[PDB]
């Protein structure tokens, strides 16, 4: 539901390591296993980020929704109020 | 306390179709008045600051996700591709 600062500096931890390998004399030299170990972890993470990402989305826009009902209704009853007072004015 | 404005997610709908069917009748003073809509505005209305707020709160988090999300799509097609040579 939440992505933690440890999972997302595992993010650019891998990304970023993943290039002080991308031209190593080997691949086994690489697959020792702090990069084998690290990639699990961020991978295994690709579902929270998305869960936690689609949760973000969602929200925003039931909240989006809200905000434009709220919005429209506080439109509507100023028109309304508007008129009603001038109705009065006018007299 | 997000729940607290996530809850009037039904009021908020009321006050508003109710609001609305009154806009195309022009009958004013009714709706205008009757403690009821008074009621739902009473308690709709405020919500606007907390509202506006947790807008800004998740708009953040969602843009932030998403930028993540892309690193980690790179990382990943580099990480494939210094894989790839590991096949043959």
């Known amino acids: 539901v939440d992505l933690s600062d440890e ?9 970023s390591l993943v290039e002080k390998m991308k031209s190593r004399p080997l691949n086994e030299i690489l697959e020792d296993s702090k990069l084998q170990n690290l990639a699990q972890r961020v991978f295994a993470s690709k579902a929270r ?9 969602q929200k925003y826009n039931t909240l989006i929704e809200m905000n ?23 007299s | 306390k997000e729940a607290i404005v996530f809850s009037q997610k039904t009021t908020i709908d009321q006050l508003h179709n109710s609001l609305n069917a009154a806009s195309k009748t022009g009958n004013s003073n009714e709706v205008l008045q009757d403690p009821h809509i008074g009621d739902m505005y009473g308690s709709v209305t405020p919500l606007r600051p907390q509202v506006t ?4 709160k998740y708009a953040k988090e969602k843009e932030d996700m998403l930028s993540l999300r892309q690193v980690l799509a790179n990382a990943e ?3 494939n591709q210094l894989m790839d040579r590991a096949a043959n």
Request: charged share 25%; aromatic share 10%.
């Open chain 1, 7 to 15: 999972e997302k500096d595992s993010i650019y931890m891998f990304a």
């Open chain 1, 49 to 57: 980020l998305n869960y936690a990402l689609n949760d973000k989305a």
């Open chain 1, 68 to 90: 434009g009902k709220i919005s429209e209704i506080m439109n509507i009853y100023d028109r309304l109020l508007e008129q009603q007072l001038q109705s009065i004015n006018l």
């Open chain 2, 53 to 56: 707020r947790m807008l800004g």
């Open chain 2, 77 to 79: 097609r580099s990480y």
